[PDB]
């Protein structure tokens, strides 16, 4: 089939993992990126090549390309976890070749053919086929945050508690749990670093909105704890304010680490709590979770869908080309809320 | 019945919690205990009144006079959690009735009438009638850290990895594990402050001996954890040693935390272990373990008295008279290697 033989993409400048490690802020993307035009990669008989229609860009990915994430970088190739786009060419096996033609969100996983790029290679059992009637937008943000907010807000939901708690409350992941929460009548307790994200995340159902920031925070904190008395802490930033949330939570509480925006020391301020509270810390990843949980997968996948096609949910601060994403991706990532998009 | 009224007993002389902790090493007594004559206790319903004789000293009861440990002091009462005795008096309830008489291993949990005295309180559950023919040595050591190594254990067990990690791996806990480990085939990694306890640990069992205090420590502990691949870290120390164990060992590694003898910041060196690398941390408690498995606790306590009356299990560097307790019990602890006891 007639496909292009050469495409612009986002190159990995970064091979492996990184030697210097720099945060979570992405201040540039020329030390990580490069665009260029390469050739268009050929699916493995399991594969697709998807003609990328729009890609996100989530923290993952800025951990990712600065060699800071648990996935090491294959130097050159363009990176870019999740999309949309039409498939226009399938691996031998017949999952790839029905999905010929049809639109899909997808995640790239270990490809290691990005979706910030024209084409991008995914497995095709890493693409969710869309409803003839759902929104291209919709799509490119389907898998990494709607899968975890189910999948996390399903661990909130077993443990039985009405109050669970997540620090980096205004990120887009965040949102989506927030939701789900009001949904059910669960009672999120959110961190922010802005006091103008508090109204936002109250308005979407947060029940509290802690400026950790404030010089009284963790006394606020504490009183929080036990007017609430929390069990799940899902937490993306770690460092001294997840060590100072996890110190007040109360007895038998879960610090579930699914991200690491605060590269600080990450301190158990009181280990007698594991012992006499029963605390316990554990990690979250999602590719882990639909390895170990394949029978939800599906499920969580059908759920995610409906939710965009019947309105519950639909995603956007910035569509920024591609051409133009090597020099303005960090200046759309710095203003707060909303996710930023590449359009090749 | 003919009981004394007046006893000889080592008294807290702290309340509740302390506000200034002071690390694990007991410098003295005489901060934190009062040699006394005090009326003798009258047991509640539940309780028997037990005539001591020989009473265990454990990392637990220094971390209670200390006021750190997860039970607070009751100013004026007798400290020590466990010993052997005789019971002398038993409240009303027909289990506490039917002890008496009876020579038993004991602990004396939440009653605030401590082993460190003539006369103790346990909750008659808290009671191990001894067979007639189980030395009183054996008696007053069987609870604690017998039936913390058998659940502990079990917890390695589980996991199937043959090979498995401690800390303070000279302490007596630590032997009765390894113990239990070479009779199994399974393989004990082990660290230690002392060159001199490598030979008597090895001897016993353990499969690794490191020495913490070696400059290539980490270097060596890293070789160690590829060629072991241990799952389990049971951690009475926690602090920078725990920190860099958790940190080397593969994946799916659990660091169970049950003593925190080390008070320096206990440190997640890479939180993204517990994401990609599926870690876990949790805390380890006798007295919860008994409570969620009031199944395994007969099975266990009929396994800790069979060991010790077939001749598999049997305790010792120091009998100390009550009356010389305060004055040298810790000249007595700082000795290497075995326990030391409380005669009154
Ligand atoms: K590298
Ligand atoms: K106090």
């Given at each position: 089939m007639t496909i292009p033989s050469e495409m612009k993409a986002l190159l990995l400048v970064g091979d492996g993992y990184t030697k210097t490690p720099s945060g979570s802020?992405?201040?540039?993307?020329?030390?990580y990126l490069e665009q260029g035009r390469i050739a268009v990669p050929a699916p493995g008989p399991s594969q697709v090549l998807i003609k990328v229609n729009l890609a996100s860009i989530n923290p993952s990915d800025v951990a990712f390309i600065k060699g800071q994430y648990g996935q090491p970088?294959?130097?050159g190739r363009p990176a870019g976890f999740e999309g949309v786009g039409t498939i226009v060419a399938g691996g031998d096996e017949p999952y790839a070749k029905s999905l010929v033609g049809k639109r899909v969100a997808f995640a790239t996983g270990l490809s290691n053919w990005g979706?910030?790029?024209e084409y991008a290679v995914a497995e095709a059992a890493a693409c969710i086929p869309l409803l003839d009637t759902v929104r291209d937008e919709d799509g490119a943000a389907m898998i990494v945050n709607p899968l975890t907010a189910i999948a996390m807000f399903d661990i909130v939901k077993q443990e039985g508690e009405k109050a669970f708690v997540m620090t980096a409350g205004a990120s887009q992941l965040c949102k989506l749990i927030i939701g789900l929460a009001k949904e059910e009548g669960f009672r999120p307790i959110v961190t922010v670093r802005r006091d103008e994200q508090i109204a936002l995340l109250k308005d979407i159902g947060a029940a509290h909105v802690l400026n950790e920031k404030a010089?009284?925070?963790?006394?606020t904190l504490r009183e929080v704890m036990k007017a609430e008395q929390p069990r799940i802490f899902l937490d993306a930033v770690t460092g001294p304010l997840a060590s100072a949330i996890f110190n007040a939570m109360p007895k038998r509480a879960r610090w579930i680490i699914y991200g690491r925006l605060d590269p600080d020391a990450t301190v158990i301020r009181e280990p007698g709590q594991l012992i006499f509270q029963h605390?316990?810390?554990e990690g979250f990843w999602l590719s882990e979770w639909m390895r170990q949980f394949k029978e939800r997968r599906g499920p969580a996948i059908l759920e995610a869908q409906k939710r965009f096609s019947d309105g519950r949910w639909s995603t956007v601060t910035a569509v920024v080309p591609l051409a133009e994403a090597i020099a303005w991706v960090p200046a759309e990532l710095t203003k707060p809320n909303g996710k930023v998009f590449i359009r090749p």
């Open positions: 802020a992405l201040e540039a993307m020329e030390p970088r294959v130097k979706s910030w790029a010089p009284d925070f963790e006394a605390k316990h810390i």
